[PDB]
Design a protein around this ligand. Structure first.
Ligand SMILES: */C=C/C(=O)Nc1cccc(-c2c[nH]c3ncnc(OC)c23)c1
Length: 267
């Protein structure tokens, strides 16, 4: 028995590869002959069909302007998850590539504010994302940024570099472990997409972060924004800020917190 998200596969056409998802290719396509969509597919043997479809099931419950929106599901093999098309690709590639070279702090903080707004919704809905990072943010026209890849997201009831230590070690995933990941994402934004903890392997990251080590202020990043990162990286997850606070802080940043900001060479 199917629900009202289900469509027939013949209503989809797949034009062009957009890249590799976690478990199969993602394609740009059209739906019902007039809607541009993205279509996540499942590579054979990677994982079971319904484990793949848990991603679609979580997106059925989520609807916000800063989260990539589910459109439709084909729940018979070959499975397709059909969703909103984001024309500028993943944020990580955007930051690393030609276009991000001219991004400066006002645009980067505005992207962080949009991401914080989507995560504030996740927060209000009592969900956790667990895979928050620049590779899982998608960019659209006018530099809209949206939270994507809900493959691990879940109603509240792993790469150590982005994952809060209590989640990596003990599996304690809460919205505060996502707040930690958002702090790491802020470093990806202010370094034009560099890998966090440069020159450290995972085991060193784990040992050091447990000893109190935190990344220093990126070059030309204001101390006030590095302070925000350090708050997101507090050892005690309950001392980390809420996404509601991060959204407001970042939206108001250049009036309330850095009214004297001056452009630099890179930020
Ligand atoms: C950061 C690299 C990366 O993950 N790129 C990437 C892979 C697969 C798909 C996409 C992509 C691009 N536009 C999209 N719109 C909607 N959904 C997507 O994937 C789910 C999109 C980028």
């Amino acid at each position: 028995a199917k629900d009202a998200w289900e469509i027939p596969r013949e209503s989809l056409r797949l034009e062009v590869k957009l890249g590799q998802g976690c478990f199969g290719e993602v394609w740009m396509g059209t739906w019902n002959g007039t809607t541009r969509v993205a279509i996540k597919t499942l590579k054979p043997g990677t994982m079971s069909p319904e484990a793949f479809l848990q991603e679609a099931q979580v997106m059925k419950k989520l609807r916000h302007e800063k989260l990539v929106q589910l459109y439709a599901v084909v729940s018979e093999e070959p499975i397709y998850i059909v969703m909103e098309y984001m024309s500028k690709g993943c944020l990580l590639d955007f930051l690393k590539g030609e276009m991000g070279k001219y991004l400066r702090l006002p645009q980067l903080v505005d992207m962080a504010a949009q991401i914080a707004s989507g995560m504030a919704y996740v927060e209000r809905m009592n969900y956790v994302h667990r895979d928050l990072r620049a590779a899982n943010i998608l960019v659209g026209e006018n530099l809209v940024c949206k939270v994507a890849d809900f493959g691990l997201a879940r109603l509240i009831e792993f790469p150590i570099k982005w994952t809060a230590p209590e989640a990596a070690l003990y599996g304690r995933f809460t919205i505060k472990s996502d707040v930690w990941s958002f702090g790491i994402l802020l470093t990806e934004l202010t370094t034009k997409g560099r890998v966090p903890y440069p020159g450290m392997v995972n085991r060193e990251v784990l040992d050091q972060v447990e000893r109190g080590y935190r990344m220093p202020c990126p070059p030309e990043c204001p101390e006030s924004l590095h302070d925000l990162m350090c708050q997101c990286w507090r050892k005690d997850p309950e001392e980390r800020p809420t996404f509601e606070y991060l959204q407001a802080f970042l939206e108001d940043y250049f009036t309330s917190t850095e009214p004297q900001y001056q452009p630099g060479e890179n930020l």
